[PDB]
Design a binder for this molecule. Structure first.
Ligand code: NO2
Ligand code: NO2
Ligand code: NO2
Ligand code: CU
Ligand code: CU
Ligand code: CU
Ligand code: CU
Ligand code: CU
Ligand code: CU
Ligand code: CU
Ligand code: CU
Ligand code: CU
Lengths: 336, 336, 336
């Protein structure tokens, strides 16, 4: 496509929504190729990641951890206006694993506080992909400070299983998993810092142990529980998009399954089926499609149970509906 | 199926056998759907896991670590009678990754010492699946104390390769891999405790490092080596079911391969072929099919060689038969 | 084939080249089955792995880390002459994951300093496979000292996608990833030893932590950058073979993708497509096929960014050619 043909394409401005929600979109593409426009302001901010009050000097796209999920269709163009407010102190940029060239866009988006840039790339490959900041000299630090998210490039024809049959979800949720490495003092207590820079040296030491102090969904322990628990109903089809820009994870829906799982996150790669626990490597996004068959509370976790229950990697799904005794029933309740 | 149709289904009691062995079963289903009945008594007991007398207060389904392998066919019902003797001191339950609803059955099987419960679930998805105890608030602890196992839900038509060609094994083994986190004193000696709960705090501290002190098969270092090595003969087709309820593993048959490997452990997902080393994520089970071609001793290991030879993740296969010089031969034996 | 039939097969002597380059070969088999001959001399030498002068007493096949990549075709016979110089002090052998029998050849190739041996095996399974030393009693040690490599067993008819379409690469590179566990003194400084055996004890304690001090490509930090960066040009098809003999890895081409990826490294297992980041379990090799579309410098890393940018797992690709504004363009360059 020439610059003229591209400039002639229709454009649609999209308003991003905070994770785990996803902005309105059409599973099946509307018309031909479009230039989808997104805008994100980078915010360096202090966030609390657990009930104890542990602090992290986050570097958040659109002000959230993970950054929001941008959705486009294959062969559409994603035009991102990225802003780094003069209130920030570090240089930032963005790298789309979905894009091709200049380190995923990182080599063309280096912006200092008080600057902005607009990047456009053709979404040539369908699937879910990770995106993260990557400043030459402190890549891992920025990413484990929460500066990452994901995008979804849907086939123009929507989703299908490995045999041509359509897969249409009723709901979609984006679970961004984050590994945090918070310094501790001699008492084993998490340390606090005045500015993000102050924590760098101590943090790097923790990072080198390759042992995160916290592994959380949506920026904090329990962030997707209670009133923030995700929801569904028996019969409802749900697509759960999951990303981890730095460390491996192994998603598992307790009480359920991944009926169709694109574990590698790429739609032209047939999804695995009837999965109990799938695997997403650090630096990637994956997606699972499931039709709920039983009501009740479900937990969605990274299945290294220590990471799930001791480190923070557990979310909840509240599901309404009629219980199915054929699928499961208590013949004899706990009794003497 | 109607209420009457389900109640009319044949009920069959099956006696379990200890791992790595598997109870008698047929690969191709014999007759229509059945309600297969199993009973397991829970045992809390101290076990030694290495040659240094290191102890673990194990929580074992049916008295073994891993728990035994239950085998049923797709659409059969698995009805488990779970017993927690008055001699035990902890609460227990069971979570079947193969089941649908109530956290895999955990929310319906919480039993205190002196109680029993009967759970029935329809095995709707074919594959090998992990099962483990999962008491709200103490999941990882009981799981890494050995309270986990697996089940195999065979297709009613038996196993087949990605092309539809049947795969019939002559024998089957179940290797359950366990990550243990044993506390050590300031001198580096593993500590001993009077009761399970006494070790809780120290153990959780070790668990948080995400670094197991031991990684073993069948509950102890060397449990499947020497005189307890598994066996086979040249020409024999063997299915090796492998599980890890909490941590990733990478099985490898030294000297052999995984001719067909359902790495995700699910039969409707085509198996990978000619595998050197496969990957099973924590929270799942997988299965490898291999036809032995050469006689001799083979080592079956988790291929992070430190976990295999330093931590204990190594088993052996003793194979009888005639050597094949076409496949391999020493043209010049070691010499000056 | 009988002994006589094999002895009648044509032989071909191959000259090995140092990684990341691969010795001359043909993608499509040039003629019928033959006995491909290779010779490697084991070199026990000191190598500096980082810019801090950190040393490792390496055990290297053919004098390099990783060992060179041997290329044959399915059903050819690989005849390796392994030599252990009198100048060496340790016992060595070789285990081919691609071979069938005697622990992959390790039980037939044990050679003391001043000895040699000739092993011949039939490459019956197509794909990339790991090969490494495995001295009963100290396995993990030699392997994590750099004594491992890989070989490639191409289909007779060359490479194909999942649908049978031919995949012909213009260039091929072999990246051997290595996890090192270097002991430190009480000041956190890496220690040096005058003899290999001298570091054994100290090394074993670091290995127990399952936390490498270094994770590198081709034996050292920055080894595959600058004067050793891999090259290509827009439109060129490149196959990137990657192996890890002891620990998991998740390769990612920054700015690009893995158009076709045999993640398990086995050719009869259909490759995944449009990959952002793939996964290779410790004890295996994988291969990715990509056609560069953009010029510029690309980074190739193990996508646990701490491992890549802090521990050393990073390589570079220098690509010449013209920039493609359709795929990516900076609508608005960084500005006020
Ligand atoms: O099934 N996860 O506890
Ligand atoms: O070749 N097995 O370590
Ligand atoms: O997108 N590679 O860091
Ligand atoms: Cu940034
Ligand atoms: Cu950054
Ligand atoms: Cu990245
Ligand atoms: Cu229990
Ligand atoms: Cu329990
Ligand atoms: Cu579970
Ligand atoms: Cu050696
Ligand atoms: Cu060795
Ligand atoms: Cu090996």
């Amino acid at each position: 496509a020439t610059a003229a043909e591209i400039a002639a394409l229709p454009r649609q401005k999209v308003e991003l929504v905070d994770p785990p929600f996803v902005h309105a979109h059409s599973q099946v593409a509307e018309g031909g190729p479009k230039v989808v426009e997104f805008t994100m302001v980078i915010e360096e901010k202090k966030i609390v990641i657990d009930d104890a009050g542990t602090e992290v000097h986050a570097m958040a796209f659109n002000g959230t951890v993970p950054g929001p999920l941008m959705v486009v269709h294959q062969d559409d163009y994603l035009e991102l206006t990225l802003i780094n407010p003069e209130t920030n102190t570090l240089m930032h940029n963005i790298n789309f694993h979905a894009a091709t060239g200049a380190l995923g866009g990182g080599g063309l988006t280096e912006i200092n506080p008080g600057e902005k840039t607009i990047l456009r790339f053709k979404a040539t490959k369908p699937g879910v992909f990770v995106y993260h900041c990557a400043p030459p000299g402190m890549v891992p630090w920025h990413v484990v400070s929460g500066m990452n998210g994901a995008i979804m490039v849907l086939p123009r024809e929507g989703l299908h299983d490995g045999k041509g049959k359509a897969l249409t979800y009723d709901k979609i949720y984006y679970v961004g998993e984050q590994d945090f490495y918070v310094p501790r003092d001699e008492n084993g207590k998490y340390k606090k810092y005045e500015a993000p820079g102050d924590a760098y040296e101590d943090t790097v030491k923790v990072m080198r142990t390759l042992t995160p102090t916290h592994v959380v969904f949506n920026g904090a322990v329990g962030a997707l529980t209670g009133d923030k628990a995700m929801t569904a109903a028996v019969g409802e089809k749900v697509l759960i998009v999951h990303s981890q820009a730095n460390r491996d994870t192994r998603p598992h829906l307790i009480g359920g399954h991944g009926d169709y799982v694109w574990a590698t996150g790429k739609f032209n790669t047939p999804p695995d089926v009837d999965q109990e626990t799938w695997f997403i490597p650090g630096g990637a996004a994956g997606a699972a499609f499931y039709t709920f068959q039983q009501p009740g509370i479900y937990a969605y976790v990274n299945h290294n149970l220590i990471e799930a229950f001791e480190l923070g990697a557990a979310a909840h799904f509240k599901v309404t509906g009629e219980w199915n005794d054929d699928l499961m029933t208590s013949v004899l309740a706990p009794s003497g």
